[PDB]
Structures are given as C-alpha cells and as structure tokens.
C-alpha cells in the first residue's frame, strides 16, 4: 500500500509515511500573477544543452523519465536564481485525465493539461542522492503545456511510449535533444520549494517558464495510454499524476519580467 494518486493512497494521503508533506516549503503553489515581485536583481536563465546525451526513457510507477549522463557538465542550468551549474539528470512530465487538468503549478488558479519538469542537481554535491539532502540541491525548470498545435520536438518521445507501457519498462532513448520542448522566451517565476512527489523533500529552487508550450490533443492522448501498474498486473492508466496546489506560507514569488 505505497504512495500513489489515487483515493486510497493518493495526495491526501502522502503525509502519514512523509510528514514533510505539511511543511514550510511544499510545492506546487498557485502563481498569483499579480503579487508576484518583479526582481530586477534575478538574471537571465542560462539554459546549455547543445551537449545533452540522453541515454534511456523509464516507466517508474508514476511517470516516464528521460534519463540524462550526468557524469559530466553536459547540460546545464546557471543563472537565474541560481548560484552555482546544476546538471540535467531526467526530464518527465504529469498530465491529467482531461485537457482541463494536470498540470501541477497553476497560474492564477488555471490549470494546463500537462507540466514538464527538467530536473537538475547542484554539482557542487557531486551526485543526486547528496543533493536532495539540502536545501539548494535541485532546481527544476518547469514548463507548462497547452493544448493545441502539436510540438514537433516531442514526437520522438510520444512514439516509444508503447515500449515502456508498464512499470518498470525502459527503453534504449538516445539523441534526444531536450532543446526542442523549450518555448521561445525565458521569462520565469522562481520560489524555493519541494519535490512533488514522495519524499517531498525541500531541496528545489522552482523555476517556472511563464510561456508555455502547445502540444496536440494526439500527443498527450498517448501520455494518457500508459500504466501505473506492472506487466501482468490489473491496467490502471496512468493519468492525473499532479499534487494540488499547496499553501504558500512565508514565501513570495518572484518575477524575472515586468
Ligand atoms: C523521482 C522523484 C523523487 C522526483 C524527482 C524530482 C523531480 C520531480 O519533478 C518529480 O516529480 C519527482
Ligand atoms: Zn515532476
């Protein structure tokens, strides 16, 4: 009876094994647009991936994951918020049943059909693990999808998915250029947050792209085909994989744009 998003072991539930849950600096928040601080102090993301290697896609139970070598500064994210090169280890997304529902973060209490989150770590912790364990470990770029005209950069992706169906399932998946699911601008919001999912450690510099990107109906349709069970095992699309907004506390969003 491990964690999960459904009603038995779903969100609401996550708190008895991850009492974190109900902590100081939880995530996702709903982006008040307008109470946001612009912060002329905040500098341009610098998002260098012309060197990414991508090298295997994961089913893992609750999402696919598309796994980058790390063991190098081959992709990386600098600037912004951030002090210090925080390096690409996985990219995934949640999504939603439906169109009107998935995404995790919300902006004015709106919802996208999905949000992809690139996840990088502090090299300066010399590996994930260590990361997670502090409170400047990660920083994920997230990035909402809409629906509407198809993003071509995202195929490549959409079409293994009937390779790693179930839980467990990997694929061999690389040259995979994560530049091509990047909107045109940069401009972001940043808060200091947390996993959203178990453990829900405190350990992420949030950055979060104001535009998002358009995928089409048939795309996320076919994040909506896999499973969060095991081969063999009874089918249970995987769909609604999002943590609701949490309270946002004693924090303040920042703005990077007027
Ligand atoms: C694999 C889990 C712990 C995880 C790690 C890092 C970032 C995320 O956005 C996310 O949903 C999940
Ligand atoms: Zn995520």
Not at 22 to 31: F, Y
Not at 44 to 65: E, K
Not at 85 to 105: K, N, V
Not at 138 to 145: D, K, M, R, S
Request: some cysteine; overall charge neutral; charged content about 25%.
């Amino acid at each position: 009876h491990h964690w999960g998003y459904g009603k038995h072991n779903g969100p609401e539930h996550w708190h008895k094994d991850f009492p974190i849950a109900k902590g100081e600096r939880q995530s996702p928040v709903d982006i008040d647009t307008h109470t946001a601080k612009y912060d002329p102090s905040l500098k341009p993301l610098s998002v260098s991936y012309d060197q990414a290697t991508s090298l295997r896609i994961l089913n893992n139970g609750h999402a696919f994951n598309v796994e980058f070598d790390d063991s190098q500064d081959k992709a990386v994210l600098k600037g912004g918020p951030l002090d210090g090169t925080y390096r690409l280890i996985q990219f995934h997304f949640h999504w939603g049943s439906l169109d009107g529902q998935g995404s995790e973060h919300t902006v004015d209490k709106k919802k996208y059909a999905a949000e992809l989150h690139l996840v990088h770590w502090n090299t300066k912790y010399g590996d994930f693990g260590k990361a997670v364990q502090q409170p400047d470990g990660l920083a994920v770029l997230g990035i909402f999808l809409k629906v509407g005209s198809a993003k071509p950069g995202l195929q490549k992706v959409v079409d293994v998915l009937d390779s790693i169906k179930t839980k467990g399932k990997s694929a061999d998946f690389t040259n995979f250029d994560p530049r091509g699911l990047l909107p045109e601008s940069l401009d972001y919001w940043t808060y200091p947050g947390s996993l959203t999912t178990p453990p829900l450690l405190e350990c992420v510099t949030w950055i979060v792209l104001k535009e998002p990107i358009s995928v089409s109906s048939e795309q996320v349709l076919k994040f909506r085909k896999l499973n969060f069970n095991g081969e063999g095992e009874p089918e249970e699309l995987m769909v609604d994989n999002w943590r609701p907004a949490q309270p946002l506390k004693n924090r303040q969003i920042k703005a990077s744009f007027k």
